[PDB]
């Protein structure tokens, strides 16, 4: 019933669709853009960061200076400030091995880490991953105590990064001289495109270490006396020696789009060739440089007219520069096609000749300009070389502030060169990044958490100070971006802090409080222990005016409060919302049969908010009414059943009120127990200096208070019943039949009974338990001691105000425990800000907050990387 024409129509369409996919696969294998997702740079001129490089060149400064004395060397150069500094501890390296380690190895390890932070990748996620390492590097003489062979082989400069970081892609060191780092880049894009790796670190490193290189070039005569490179100038008189690290993180663009990576730029094409039969082993070949430029255009599908900026090799050699300018004039200078003259420059005018790091230092410069739409500036000293023909007007030096203007493709592109003395040449086309086009609990906030992390306390404060400087230097950076970056695009170490602020000015101010040891309002600090969280549900005392009224919006919170409303409305005459939200003729919070069910509701709802935010209890613990809340959080009891237990138990308590009294005695236990002899009982021990004495017979209480006046701090609890005494025995039979239909179940979270004094299964919590819980002493001090000596590291009190937090800390002090004690809401603050602060604090103690579920996803921003705490190591053999 389908005509032959219709059937063959659908096969033809499928065949040509399959053909389109095949040919798209061909294009991917040959020329997929490689996204540059991260970059780091430690270069001369006090350039510890790519952004420092931008500042140095837009400020027209160079870096030539006399040789340092720290190295064991009429002598000027371009030297890195901390070439010898290394945080050996960070990488698990002994100071013995670090001293024996070529600084080139150490600078590569540190700069790779910063590149991974610039790409927003927490390096632990890469362990066991498929990630390659491509280091352009050349052997220098650092060692001319043990581990000296592993610390000086070139192959270990790439493999050591793989080992430390646990990477399992290919790890190569490659030497093509001044082209080494662009060759490393070229090989890594081939490796990605072949699927040998899914991520690659590529770049180059050199540090002048041994006597040779500086005096070797002086006799050779290629050095300038200033130590300044003057590329493309009639004052050209040689290059100034330099050093540095420069690395990039490379990923197939399709994978970067799919994982939502901020892309700094793309490698659109690169080529690598050789001079071949030239005028001599070290002599550049202008025709070879045309061949390589044109090959790069081929593999990027572009022509010269599409590149507006060229970052040249530019060394400042009188006869080297005209060869490069000739080759540029024959390529980029022709068929400009009214795109305006190509703008030419060389980062070497500002930092010297970084040797194996020259090329990726040029890429990094170009990316800096691509961020801003601004041509990357070059010093340009004096007049244009008389040996070069700019008559055409089609090549111009990148003198000052220029707008970087796109090609017919509306895309901004640059070409980057590096030519080696061995003859191996490289050219890379860097294009601007394509358009990137593309759910929160605790929704409205106003304020914003910024979490910080480092391996030691001094490193932690340094991170706070440097982020303070960066934010002061760059106002207008969205606070949601700082927060998401600091939370998700960074690895979290043992020592932690968090600042909670509404605006960049408040964040800077509080970050600087963390940089000092200051204890100020919006600041929390702690160290991250594993061992698990205990949720603590206290007894009487947490109530306040419309506690957590501000939390009623948060959908996961209001959801829970709804179920309590249904259950409590059938069982009692009222609901939770009436009591917490404005109270229009609603039950009084002073009534024991309303405060206990309403507190129950707020604690179960808070505990659900906590869990929705990533905090998982490893155990629960309650105190009188509170174990009912814990029993529901731990799943031993449905919400319906628990709201029934607390409703009926507090109504029973109300029935026996009057004639009762409860007082808090700031004293130990046997002590008060002894004093209790004659002169009625201890109903609660919560802390080694906090007992609650009940016995009612208010007259009695009224007397003990008097006596206590002598020296014992005693205070009356605003309550006219005496629970955990015989005063509750009349309700025994009526309450156990009223709760005969409760259904206790095995707890999903472990449950530590402060009645039994040991973990419970969950099925033991029938109506009989809830009576004993009301009748018997609350043995809470013991319960905390038990949990501490089993390894629990965080106590979170889930309550609208902290009541047991003090007594828990006291118990930990006498146990000399490091364990943290945190709260949830406070009397003044039951808002979403106080809760955000509670999450922030719990984070600094090791609790796992899905910061993305709480805040949402924002954008990666270029914030400072880890603050390495380096000692100096410089072997003098």
């Amino acid at each position: 019933a389908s005509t032959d024409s219709e059937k063959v129509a659908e096969y033809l369409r499928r065949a040509t669709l399959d053909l389109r996919a095949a040919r798209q696969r061909i294009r991917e294998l040959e020329s997929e853009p490689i996204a540059i997702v991260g970059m780091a740079c430690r270069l001369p001129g006090e350039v510890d960061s790519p952004e420092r490089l931008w500042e140095l060149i837009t400020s027209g400064r160079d870096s030539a200076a006399e040789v340092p004395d720290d190295r064991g060397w009429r002598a000027h150069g371009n030297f890195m400030a901390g070439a010898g500094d290394f945080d050996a501890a960070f990488f698990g390296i002994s100071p013995r091995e670090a001293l024996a380690m070529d600084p080139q190895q150490r600078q590569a390890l540190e700069t790779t880490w910063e590149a991974l932070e610039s790409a927003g990748i927490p390096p632990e996620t890469l362990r066991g991953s498929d990630t390659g390492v491509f280091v352009g590097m050349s052997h220098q003489g650092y060692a001319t105590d043990g581990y000296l062979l592993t610390g000086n082989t070139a192959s270990v400069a790439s493999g050591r990064i793989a080992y430390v970081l646990g990477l399992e892609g290919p790890a190569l060191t490659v030497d093509t001289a001044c082209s080494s780092s662009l060759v490393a880049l070229h090989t890594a894009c081939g490796s990605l495109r072949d699927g040998d790796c899914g991520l690659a670190v590529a770049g180059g490193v050199s540090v002048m270490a041994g006597p040779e290189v500086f005096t070797e070039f002086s006799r050779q005569g290629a050095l300038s006396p200033d130590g300044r490179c003057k590329p493309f100038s009639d004052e050209a008189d040689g290059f100034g020696l330099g050093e540095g690290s420069a690395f990039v993180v490379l990923q197939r663009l399709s994978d970067a789009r799919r994982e939502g990576r901020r892309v700094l730029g793309v490698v659109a094409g690169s080529a690598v060739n050789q001079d071949g039969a030239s005028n001599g082993l070290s002599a550049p070949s202008g025709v070879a440089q045309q061949r390589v430029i044109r090959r790069a255009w081929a593999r990027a599908g572009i022509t010269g007219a599409d590149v507006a900026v060229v970052e040249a090799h530019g060394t400042g050699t009188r006869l080297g520069d005209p060869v490069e300018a000739s080759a540029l004039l024959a390529t980029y200078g022709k068929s400009r096609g009214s795109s305006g003259p190509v703008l030419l420059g060389s980062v070497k005018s500002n930092i010297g000749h970084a040797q194996a790091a020259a090329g990726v230092a040029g890429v990094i410069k170009v990316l800096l300009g691509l961020e801003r739409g601004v041509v990357p500036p070059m010093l340009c000293r004096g007049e244009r070389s008389g040996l070069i023909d700019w008559s055409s007007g089609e090549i111009e030096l990148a003198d000052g502030v220029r707008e970087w203007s796109p090609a017919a493709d509306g895309v901004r592109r640059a070409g980057v060169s590096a030519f080696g003395v061995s003859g191996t040449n490289a050219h890379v086309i860097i294009a601007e990044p394509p358009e990137p086009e593309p759910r929160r609990m605790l929704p409205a906030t106003g304020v914003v958490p910024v979490v910080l992390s480092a391996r030691t306390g001094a490193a932690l404060r340094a991170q706070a100070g440097r982020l303070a400087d960066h934010l002061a230097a760059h106002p207008g950076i969205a606070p949601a971006d700082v927060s998401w970056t600091m939370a998700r695009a960074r690895q979290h170490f043992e020592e932690r802090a968090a600042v909670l602020a509404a605006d960049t000015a408040e964040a800077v101010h509080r970050l600087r409080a963390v940089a000092d040891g200051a204890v100020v309002p919006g600041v929390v600090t702690g160290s991250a222990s594993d061992g698990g969280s205990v949720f603590v549900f206290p007894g009487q005392g947490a109530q306040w005016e419309g506690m957590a009224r501000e939390l009623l919006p948060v959908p996961v919170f209001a959801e829970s409060i709804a179920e309590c409303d249904a259950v409590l409305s059938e069982v009692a005459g009222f609901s939770v919302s009436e009591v917490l939200e404005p109270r229009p003729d609603a039950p009084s919070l002073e009534r024991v049969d309303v405060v206990q069910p309403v507190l129950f509701a707020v604690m179960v709802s808070l505990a659900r908010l906590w869990r929705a935010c990533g905090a998982v209890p490893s155990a629960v613990i309650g105190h009188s009414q509170g174990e009912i809340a814990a029993a529901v959080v731990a799943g031993a009891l449905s919400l319906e059943d628990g709201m029934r237990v607390v409703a009926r138990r507090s109504r029973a308590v109300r029935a026996v009120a009057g004639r009762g009294s409860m007082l808090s005695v700031r004293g130990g236990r046997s002590d008060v127990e002894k004093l209790l002899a004659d002169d009625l009982e201890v109903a609660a021990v919560n802390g080694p200096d906090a007992v609650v004495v009940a016995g009612d017979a208010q007259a009695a209480r009224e007397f003990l208070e008097y006596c206590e006046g002598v020296g014992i701090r005693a205070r009356a609890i605003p309550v006219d019943y005496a629970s955990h005494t015989a005063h509750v025995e009349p309700v025994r039979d009526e309450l156990v039949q009223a709760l005969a239909g409760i259904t206790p179940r095995r707890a999903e979270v472990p449950f530590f009974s402060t009645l039994t004094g040991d973990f419970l299964d969950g099925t033991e919590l029938d109506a009989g338990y809830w009576y004993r819980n009301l009748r018997h002493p609350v043995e809470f001090h013991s319960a905390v001691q038990a949990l501490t000596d089993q390894g629990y590291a965080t106590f979170i009190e889930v309550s609208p105000h902290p009541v047991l937090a003090s007594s828990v800390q006291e118990t930990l002090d006498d146990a000399e425990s490091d364990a943290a004690v945190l709260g949830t809401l406070e009397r003044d603050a039951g808002d979403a800000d106080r809760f955000l602060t509670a999450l922030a604090d719990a984070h600094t103690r090791g609790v796992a907050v899905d910061w993305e579920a709480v805040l949402g996803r924002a954008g990666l921003v270029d914030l400072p990387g880890y603050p390495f705490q380096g000692k100096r190591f410089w072997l003098l053999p």
Partner: protein
């Protein structure tokens, strides 16, 4: 990327009507015929019908068991294909797939379950298959709708557990059986409890099994 997102099924009493949607994306919807194929529980793929592309007349063909009751439509402006089911029967219970193409089905949707039943929501009755290697289990009978989940010792016991596909009895109610094979040391401090859970009737049952 090519997408065919389906929606619009669920429970529905015999004789009533129901319309399924298929929203296309990532390709030129108007260029393709679109077909509906269904699969009754446990059985094969059965053709329901298709609509041609407009270029071929935008006309429709149907299987005999749905002709006059079901109709296929398309809306090329919203890139949506529709199945309009009328006078539904229990026999029309199935997963319904829309698929790109009328002869070559080269892209399918996630499918949409349509359950045709006049049963009312009902909780299960749990009975224990006492352990007459020993075998014991739980028989979860006479509930509606699906699903119902079963675990053993609150998820502690997972080795040797088989929970079986539910069956639909002549009453129109579902029955499921869960079994676990345990060492014949059936008393050695090893109490065995099946935990059955039927959200659509707010039911949670725990049962012990023993001789």
């Amino acid at each position: 990327e090519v997408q065919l997102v389906q929606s619009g099924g669920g429970l529905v009493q015999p004789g009533r009507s129901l319309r399924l949607s298929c929203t296309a994306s990532g390709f030129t919807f108007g260029d393709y015929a679109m077909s509906w194929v269904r699969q009754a529980p446990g059985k094969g793929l059965e053709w329901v019908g298709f609509i041609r592309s407009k270029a071929y007349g935008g006309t429709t063909e149907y299987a005999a068991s749905v002709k006059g009751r079901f109709t296929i439509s398309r809306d090329d402006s919203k890139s949506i294909a529709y199945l309009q089911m009328n006078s539904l029967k229990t026999e029309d219970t199935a997963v319904y797939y829309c698929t790109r193409g009328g002869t070559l089905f080269d892209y399918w949707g996630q499918g949409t379950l349509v359950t045709v039943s006049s049963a009312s929501t009902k909780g299960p009755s749990v009975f224990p298959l006492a352990p007459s290697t020993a075998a014991l289990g739980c028989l979860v009978k006479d509930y509606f709708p699906e699903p119902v989940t079963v675990s053993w010792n609150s998820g502690a016991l997972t080795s040797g557990v088989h929970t079986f596909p539910a069956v639909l009895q002549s009453s129109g109610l579902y029955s499921l059986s869960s079994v676990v094979t345990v060492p014949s040391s059936s008393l050695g401090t090893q109490t065995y409890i099946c935990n059955v859970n039927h959200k659509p009737s707010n039911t949670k049952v725990d049962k012990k099994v023993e001789p």
